[PDB]
Design a protein around this ligand. Structure first.
Ligand SMILES: [K+]
Ligand SMILES: [K+]
Ligand SMILES: [K+]
Ligand SMILES: [K+]
Ligand SMILES: [K+]
Ligand SMILES: [K+]
Ligand SMILES: [K+]
Ligand SMILES: [K+]
Ligand SMILES: [K+]
Ligand SMILES: [K+]
Ligand SMILES: [K+]
Ligand SMILES: [K+]
Ligand SMILES: [K+]
Ligand SMILES: [K+]
Ligand SMILES: [K+]
Ligand SMILES: [K+]
Ligand SMILES: [K+]
Ligand SMILES: [K+]
Ligand SMILES: [K+]
Ligand SMILES: [K+]
Ligand SMILES: [K+]
Ligand SMILES: [K+]
Ligand SMILES: [K+]
Ligand SMILES: [K+]
Ligand SMILES: [K+]
Ligand SMILES: [K+]
Ligand SMILES: [K+]
Ligand SMILES: [K+]
Ligand SMILES: [K+]
Ligand SMILES: [K+]
Ligand SMILES: [K+]
Ligand SMILES: [K+]
Ligand SMILES: [K+]
Ligand SMILES: [K+]
Ligand SMILES: [K+]
Ligand SMILES: [K+]
Ligand SMILES: [K+]
Ligand SMILES: [K+]
Ligand SMILES: [K+]
Ligand SMILES: [K+]
Ligand SMILES: [K+]
Ligand SMILES: [K+]
Ligand SMILES: [K+]
Ligand SMILES: [K+]
Ligand SMILES: [K+]
Ligand SMILES: [K+]
Ligand SMILES: [K+]
Ligand SMILES: [K+]
Ligand SMILES: [K+]
Ligand SMILES: [K+]
Ligand SMILES: [K+]
Ligand SMILES: [K+]
Ligand SMILES: [K+]
Ligand SMILES: [K+]
Ligand SMILES: [K+]
Ligand SMILES: [Mg+2]
Ligand SMILES: [Mg+2]
Ligand SMILES: [Mg+2]
Ligand SMILES: [Mg+2]
Ligand SMILES: [Mg+2]
Ligand SMILES: [Mg+2]
Ligand SMILES: [Mg+2]
Ligand SMILES: [Mg+2]
Ligand SMILES: [Mg+2]
Ligand SMILES: [Mg+2]
Ligand SMILES: [Mg+2]
Ligand SMILES: [Mg+2]
Ligand SMILES: [Mg+2]
Ligand SMILES: [Mg+2]
Ligand SMILES: [Mg+2]
Ligand SMILES: [Mg+2]
Ligand SMILES: [Mg+2]
Ligand SMILES: [Mg+2]
Ligand SMILES: [Mg+2]
Ligand SMILES: [Mg+2]
Ligand SMILES: [Mg+2]
Ligand SMILES: [Mg+2]
Ligand SMILES: [Mg+2]
Ligand SMILES: [Mg+2]
Ligand SMILES: [Mg+2]
Ligand SMILES: [Mg+2]
Ligand SMILES: [Mg+2]
Ligand SMILES: [Mg+2]
Ligand SMILES: [Mg+2]
Ligand SMILES: [Mg+2]
Ligand SMILES: [Mg+2]
Ligand SMILES: [Mg+2]
Ligand SMILES: [Mg+2]
Ligand SMILES: [Mg+2]
Ligand SMILES: [Mg+2]
Ligand SMILES: [Mg+2]
Ligand SMILES: [Mg+2]
Ligand SMILES: [Mg+2]
Ligand SMILES: [Mg+2]
Ligand SMILES: [Mg+2]
Ligand SMILES: [Mg+2]
Ligand SMILES: [Mg+2]
Ligand SMILES: [Mg+2]
Ligand SMILES: [Mg+2]
Ligand SMILES: [Mg+2]
Ligand SMILES: [Mg+2]
Ligand SMILES: [Mg+2]
Ligand SMILES: [Mg+2]
Ligand SMILES: [Mg+2]
Ligand SMILES: [Mg+2]
Ligand SMILES: [Mg+2]
Ligand SMILES: [Mg+2]
Ligand SMILES: [Mg+2]
Ligand SMILES: [Mg+2]
Ligand SMILES: [Mg+2]
Ligand SMILES: [Mg+2]
Ligand SMILES: [Mg+2]
Ligand SMILES: [Mg+2]
Ligand SMILES: [Mg+2]
Ligand SMILES: [Mg+2]
Ligand SMILES: [Mg+2]
Ligand SMILES: [Mg+2]
Ligand SMILES: [Mg+2]
Ligand SMILES: [Mg+2]
Ligand SMILES: [Mg+2]
Ligand SMILES: [Mg+2]
Ligand SMILES: [Mg+2]
Ligand SMILES: [Mg+2]
Lengths: 154, 97, 118
RNA sequence: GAAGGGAGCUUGACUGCGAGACCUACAAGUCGAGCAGGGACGAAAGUCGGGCUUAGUGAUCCGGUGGUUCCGCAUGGAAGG
RNA sequence: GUAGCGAAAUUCCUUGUCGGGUAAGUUCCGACCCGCACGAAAGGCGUAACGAUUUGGGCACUGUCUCAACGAGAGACUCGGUGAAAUUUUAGUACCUGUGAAGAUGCAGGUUACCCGCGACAGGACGGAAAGACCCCAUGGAGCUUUACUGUAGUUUGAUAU
RNA sequence: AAGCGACUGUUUAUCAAAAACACAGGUCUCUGCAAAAUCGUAAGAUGAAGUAUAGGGGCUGACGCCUGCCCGGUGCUGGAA
RNA sequence: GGUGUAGUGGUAGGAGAGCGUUCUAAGGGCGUUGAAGGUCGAUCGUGAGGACGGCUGGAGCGCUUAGAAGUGAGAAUGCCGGUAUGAGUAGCGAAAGACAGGUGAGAAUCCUGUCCACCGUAUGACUAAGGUUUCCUGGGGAAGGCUCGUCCGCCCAGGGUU
RNA sequence: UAUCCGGGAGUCAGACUGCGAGUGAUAAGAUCCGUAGUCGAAAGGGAAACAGCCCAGACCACCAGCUAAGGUCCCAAAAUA
RNA sequence: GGUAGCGGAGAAAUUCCAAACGAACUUGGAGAUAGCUGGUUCUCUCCGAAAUAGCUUUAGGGCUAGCCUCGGAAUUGAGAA
RNA sequence: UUAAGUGAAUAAGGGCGCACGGUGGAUGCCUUGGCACUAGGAGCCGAUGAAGGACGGGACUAACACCGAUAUGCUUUGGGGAGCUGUAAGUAAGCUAUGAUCCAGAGAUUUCCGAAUGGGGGAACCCAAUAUCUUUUAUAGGAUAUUACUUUUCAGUGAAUACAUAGCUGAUUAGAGGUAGACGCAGAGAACUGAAACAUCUUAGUACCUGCAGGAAGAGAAAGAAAAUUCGAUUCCCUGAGUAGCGGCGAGCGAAACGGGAAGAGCCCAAACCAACAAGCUUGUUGGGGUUGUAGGACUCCGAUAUGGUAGUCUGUUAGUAUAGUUGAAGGAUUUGGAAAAUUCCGCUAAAGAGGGUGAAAGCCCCGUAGACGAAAUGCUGACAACACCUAGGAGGAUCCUGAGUACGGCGGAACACGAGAAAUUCCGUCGGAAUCCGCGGGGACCAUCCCGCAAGGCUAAAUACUCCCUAGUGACCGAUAGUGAACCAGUACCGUGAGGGAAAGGUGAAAAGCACCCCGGAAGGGGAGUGAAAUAGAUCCUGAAACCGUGUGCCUACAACAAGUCAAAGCUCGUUAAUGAGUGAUGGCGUGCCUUUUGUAGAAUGAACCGGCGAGUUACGAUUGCAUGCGAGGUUAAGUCGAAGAGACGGAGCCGCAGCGAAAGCGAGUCUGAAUAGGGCGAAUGAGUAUGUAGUCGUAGACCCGAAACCAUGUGAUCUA
């Protein structure tokens, strides 16, 4: 704003006589290079909902997936070593081709690594799952242990 | 502001004072006491756990607004005379903690 | 999230200028003069869509009057006679008959005069 | 039919109020039957909360005087409210 | 309120009255004194010399004027070169009378007027230039004054310490 | 020939050069020296390496003739019951 | 959705519903077989506005739903830039130049010569300050020079202060 | 349609005409009230032009019709009724 | 070379102090304050004022009321003619 | 033929439409650079000469960059492996597998000015002294080292003056100055402004100035908070709360404790007393001793010579880490094309589908990324060890010690939210002036009782504040009038005496392939010919709007009074988004611009020369209402911890609501007034709230934008003028 712009202290010309429009500073907002009136300022956009509303939202997305039958539960995801080709074959076996949220229990590092690089796959741990993740994903591929941990969390 | 006419607060006089030793009590009524079972021992801790009284202020005072129906032993900072009569007529008892 | 001027300004002003085609000099070249003139044109256009009805009724009345005089009658007497005779042909059709079908207009005038006599 | 005038006795030129009204931007202003307390006059009815009615007045802050079963910075006092 | 001076750099009434000067003098000079409202160091009165001081008269001198005429040069004017500015709502931008925010190129009625220029003038465009300095207002500003209010530097007086 | 200013000077750079300022002269008053006065919080300076025939301040303004009355009021100066 | 009846001027101002701009998310698309942008057109909607063609252009951009705003200009003697009007107009800044010859693409303006004219207690000759290479030599004629320029205190390259 | 409750205002320069008064001079396009209208914030028709007068309130299209004020010899629609 | 802005200097004019001096210039407080003037950008639909009262160091400002708008509650329907 | 009547066409110029140019630089797209932050690092540099400069160094050298007479660089240790001699072309001359250029660590050199310090001085210049060395036969000349001031310590000399001291000399010691326009503490300290005026008050202990600093600072180990009975240094966050209070009781100002968290750490002296030393039984130095409020300590008795700890150390050893790096998967064809990454067909890779570049849009072409690996040298951190420094229990009180011109009081100021007020508590100046354990201070005047504590001495990490810089990133942040003033040789040009003010200016093309040659011309500039996908991409170079200027012409225009239009319309010309079409338009009707401000403006009231761009109700924190969602007599978490700068989880301290009435004690569906079971007021009967989102309005902030004359505080000016 005009206070922050460089310079602009003195009065450009006397109040009367010159025949020009009266001015106070070369940095006034109407001047080329003058300060900005209002405009963006640093601030936070984040707010918090009531805990009960948060919980209802999470339950709602998960319930919606189940009702549409887009929730695919697998007995377990084990990879001796991380290999994206093997995980891609796993998706094919499960017949999942659209966007998928892969929910893994904590510590399943090989599964997580092998899946993450696939363009349509979003990997999240059962302890860290959010409304946005579930809603974004068209299908939810979850392991049975992950579902157990989710049920405990909620 | 009233454009120079003497504002209302200026017209009106100050009044009263605040007692330094002022004591306010968290109020409880017989209808709320009905939420408990017969023979139950009602206590400030019990009320706080039940969530009926989150802030007890100087203490719990029991009032006789509603009709009590359960026998209870009630412990509180104070009791209104009507409240004590109602509790005791219901077969309960009152103790001034 | 800055929204610079863009092209909406030019688009809007160009619409006004196109509306002002044919005006005299700056009144079609310059946006401010053009807009001021286009507004007056709108005022005149709305006002004239009403005045136009008046003008043509006036024209028809004058032509009917000339034809009635030739047939031995004034415009006013002709219209009074037609109303008596229950003729609902309006002034537009009457003026058209006077200019184009003189015989038909004369027949209308005869019936009007007969009604007046009765 | 006095609200004008005179005489006797008096102090209602009362205390706590006050349904309901008028007036009104507000703050204010005006009228009020009636209830209770305790009275004046009158045999009684009953009248009396000043004067025939309408002017004779000034918000708040601050301070003085009197009363008060109110408060009293650990407690009892006090200081001060 | 003395001396002195006085219609004055002071006299409103006032071009006071009288005399001088002029054919004619609200100015000027001399005098008078009802000094609206002179006056003795914010000096009174007078004064040789001095003054790009103010005032009146005279001689000389003249285009200052009667009353304008001619001539020289620079600009202006034509041509070649170079080439701004203030102003500017758009303008195909008449006159009279009237009307209208009461003073019209633009509105009404009437009149006049072929199209485009060039050299001149300045009546109008309430012409340009400067958000009027006059006037009023703002619970504006600034400089200044004082026996305005409240302070205060200094100056001084007392107690006290050294 | 009259007014004003004695005079030479000085002044509003850029609308006023004058009758305005200065001036020599007059007068009043302060100041005994670390003088008074002034700059400075102070130190330190000017006054002045001067000393009442000197220095500061106020007024008047060459020269000539003169400068009347009032000390109640306000200042200053002195007094001290 | 249909019918009927009624209603629909409007400043300050209140309410409602929309258009368009940039960006984010998601989805679904379009683009060297030509995106955005620009331009023209006789196109659509009740309005802000939306399409579709031709041309230009040469690499990014729509659409639907939701979200966030530096979100819409014609006026502030507004700021910046560009370009007009006045206008081929004012002005071209105290004074004498003439002609012959030369140079050169081009000469009133540069060089040479002759005459003429001007200053001469200066417009001459020295120096201090200040300026700071403007000095000399050879080139140049974009710009600067109030015209012109072959020329210059200008530009280019060398050199010069013992 | 009135109330009452609440959110958001703007307005505190008014003008003229008719009628009733004051001030003024029984002047003012004056001034100050009361009352009605219009303008303000209202386009259209009439009053030559002419905010406030007369008629009349524009959501739009029409080269249809009937009227209001005001008009009908020509400009200029309609009676040389 | 010296004197510097709460200042200097002034033969005194508010006169000079770097082309505007009743208080220099520059930067900062600073986006001073401005009941004052100017400006404030797309569209359509519904409704639509006021220029008054009271009080005001108040009079071209402001506050409450009056007049407008949006939502709501309720009624023995209380409004208008 | 005569007469009467009618009578087109022509354009000196102009208008409209259209087409094509020019000018100019809007728009679109793009980006060298910015903006706001996050994580980590680093938080100082200087007499061992700094920050910042001047002048120099290149084969050519004007500028920038780098370097300093060892000058476009030197040495050394590592990295890297083919070109390299900057910008920056062009020559010219060279270097490089004997490993160059280049990258990182360490080191050498580092002119002159500048605190600048041998002296001087108008910065980058001048002139010296001493000693050694050097040139000359010799003087002159040259090089090197030392030579400021003050402070510390020491030594010698040494006055008035006898001793002395002062001074002087030398040696020794550590300071000066600059910053990072930030943060901290302190001294000094405004005004505009608000209060609708203004003085108390507010702005505000703010801006400015000055001092001192440190990487943080400050505070800090109770003469405390309290009175639930208890807590146990300090700091900071949430909350208490806009409460209690202060206040021309106005405008406004405004806590603290409790509670919840972040982080946590406690220690030294003085004194008593002891030992030694020295002088003059005390009195100073040294060492021991001892350190406190359930009083401690001395001192006297006993018993232990351990047990633990540390906020120490250029002490190593070790690990990790920072400063270069190495490695790192997978595609070919077909169509369009100048060019493929695009299209189409089949593949392949993925712990790598982050990103950037490549002739258009690439997982598989390149640089990269995931992942793996890597350090000679120098820092940093952590451990381990070493060294070092702290670290005693019990019982007695006879006596001694436990901070004096202090605490405190009067007067005058100031700080505490608290403006002298009833005013504690803290501090300053001045004066007066205590007690000391049976003692002293505090618990908001004061006293008594009770409780809590032990001043007048010192030190102390962490949580906290800030970012000039460095490294790695992020963004519903900017995209050349924006974003830093500065994307570009910017604090430059330019302006000013000076302080100081302060710009403008980005884009050819994929690649210069930057138009050989020819032609007009003195050139400039053009036309060909070429390059190119494109030259109307030709360097004023992407796109190329509008104003403005011009060329061509389809229609109209020289009897007309014109806010320039609109309505009606002949004629002429032309044929589209094919529409009851388009351009022009004789002629006729109606008709005084836009805006602002007004009772009223065409107004002869204001604003705009035109065009383009830019240019004004926003955000944060609170209040309140509507709408929406969740829960519902309940609702909800704040700070903080974990987590991607996310969601989310935990966190119930706290806030709102469920009870009101009263000034208050207090009572309570009632309560207050009152003598009152009266009346009346406010409430209940007669219940919905709360968290969040969103919108309207308001408050605090510049608060919709622009505008004063002015006020105040540092500085710069006597080159004009007095
Ligand atoms: K006289
Ligand atoms: K006089
Ligand atoms: K005479
Ligand atoms: K004279
Ligand atoms: K003179
Ligand atoms: K003459
Ligand atoms: K007017
Ligand atoms: K004229
Ligand atoms: K002034
Ligand atoms: K004089
Ligand atoms: K004199
Ligand atoms: K004299
Ligand atoms: K003179
Ligand atoms: K003078
Ligand atoms: K004299
Ligand atoms: K004197
Ligand atoms: K005097
Ligand atoms: K004198
Ligand atoms: K006297
Ligand atoms: K006296
Ligand atoms: K197009
Ligand atoms: K904005
Ligand atoms: K403008
Ligand atoms: K021009
Ligand atoms: K021109
Ligand atoms: K030459
Ligand atoms: K309302
Ligand atoms: K009237
Ligand atoms: K002078
Ligand atoms: K023509
Ligand atoms: K120096
Ligand atoms: K900083
Ligand atoms: K003040
Ligand atoms: K005010
Ligand atoms: K510290
Ligand atoms: K608060
Ligand atoms: K006040
Ligand atoms: K010890
Ligand atoms: K490639
Ligand atoms: K790529
Ligand atoms: K290391
Ligand atoms: K106090
Ligand atoms: K205490
Ligand atoms: K304590
Ligand atoms: K191109
Ligand atoms: K044309
Ligand atoms: K016409
Ligand atoms: K005017
Ligand atoms: K009662
Ligand atoms: K009651
Ligand atoms: K709700
Ligand atoms: K809300
Ligand atoms: K603001
Ligand atoms: K606001
Ligand atoms: K000077
Ligand atoms: Mg500033
Ligand atoms: Mg002008
Ligand atoms: Mg900017
Ligand atoms: Mg714009
Ligand atoms: Mg009609
Ligand atoms: Mg007490
Ligand atoms: Mg107490
Ligand atoms: Mg006379
Ligand atoms: Mg005479
Ligand atoms: Mg006199
Ligand atoms: Mg005198
Ligand atoms: Mg005199
Ligand atoms: Mg000419
Ligand atoms: Mg008139
Ligand atoms: Mg007229
Ligand atoms: Mg006209
Ligand atoms: Mg005019
Ligand atoms: Mg004028
Ligand atoms: Mg004015
Ligand atoms: Mg004189
Ligand atoms: Mg003289
Ligand atoms: Mg002058
Ligand atoms: Mg003069
Ligand atoms: Mg005098
Ligand atoms: Mg209507
Ligand atoms: Mg775009
Ligand atoms: Mg904007
Ligand atoms: Mg503009
Ligand atoms: Mg002319
Ligand atoms: Mg000349
Ligand atoms: Mg001479
Ligand atoms: Mg020369
Ligand atoms: Mg030459
Ligand atoms: Mg020339
Ligand atoms: Mg009037
Ligand atoms: Mg109005
Ligand atoms: Mg009308
Ligand atoms: Mg009007
Ligand atoms: Mg009819
Ligand atoms: Mg007719
Ligand atoms: Mg007749
Ligand atoms: Mg004066
Ligand atoms: Mg000057
Ligand atoms: Mg301020
Ligand atoms: Mg309406
Ligand atoms: Mg008042
Ligand atoms: Mg090597
Ligand atoms: Mg030196
Ligand atoms: Mg004020
Ligand atoms: Mg440090
Ligand atoms: Mg690879
Ligand atoms: Mg492919
Ligand atoms: Mg205080
Ligand atoms: Mg004291
Ligand atoms: Mg005390
Ligand atoms: Mg204790
Ligand atoms: Mg710390
Ligand atoms: Mg810029
Ligand atoms: Mg651009
Ligand atoms: Mg700039
Ligand atoms: Mg092109
Ligand atoms: Mg171009
Ligand atoms: Mg004619
Ligand atoms: Mg003609
Ligand atoms: Mg007016
Ligand atoms: Mg104008
Ligand atoms: Mg100076
Ligand atoms: Mg000097």
């Amino acid at each position: 704003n005009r206070s922050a712009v460089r310079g602009g202290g003195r009065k450009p010309w006397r109040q009367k006589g010159t025949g020009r429009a009266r001015q106070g500073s070369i940095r006034s907002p109407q001047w080329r290079g003058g300060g900005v009136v209002f405009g963006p300022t640093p601030r936070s956009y984040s707010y918090k909902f009531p805990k009960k509303v948060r919980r209802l939202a999470m339950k709602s997305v998960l319930s919606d997936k189940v009702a549409e039958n887009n929730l695919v539960a697998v007995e377990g995801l084990s990879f001796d070593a991380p290999k994206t080709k093997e995980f891609k074959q796993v998706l094919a076996n499960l017949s999942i081709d659209t966007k998928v949220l892969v929910v893994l229990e904590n510590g399943n590092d090989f599964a997580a690594l092998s899946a993450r690089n696939l363009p349509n796959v979003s990997v999240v741990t059962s302890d860290n799952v959010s409304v946005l993740d579930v809603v974004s994903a068209n299908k939810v591929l979850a392991t049975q242990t992950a579902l157990t941990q989710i049920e405990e969390v909620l | 502001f009233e454009g120079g006419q003497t504002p209302l607060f200026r017209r009106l006089p100050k009044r009263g004072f605040t007692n330094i030793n002022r004591k306010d009590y968290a109020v409880v009524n017989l209808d709320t006491l009905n939420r408990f079972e017969d023979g139950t021992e009602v206590t400030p801790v019990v009320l706080k756990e039940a969530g009926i009284v989150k802030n007890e202020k100087a203490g719990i005072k029991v009032l006789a607004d509603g009709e009590l129906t359960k026998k209870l032993t009630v412990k509180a900072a104070k009791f209104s005379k009507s409240a004590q009569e109602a509790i005791e007529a219901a077969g309960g008892s009152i103790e001034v903690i | 999230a800055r929204v610079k001027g863009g092209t909406v300004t030019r688009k809007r002003r160009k619409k006004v200028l196109k509306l002002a085609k044919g005006y005299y000099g700056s009144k079609h070249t310059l946006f401010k003069s053009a807009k001021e003139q286009v507004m007056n044109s709108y005022y005149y256009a709305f006002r004239d869509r009403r005045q136009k009805k008046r003008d043509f009724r006036k024209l028809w009345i004058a032509r009917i009057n000339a034809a009635a005089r030739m047939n031995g009658l004034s415009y006013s007497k002709l219209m009074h006679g037609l109303k008596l005779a229950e003729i609902d042909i309006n002034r537009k059709m009457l003026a058209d008959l006077a200019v184009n079908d003189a015989a038909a207009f004369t027949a209308l005038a005869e019936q009007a005069k007969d009604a007046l006599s009765k």
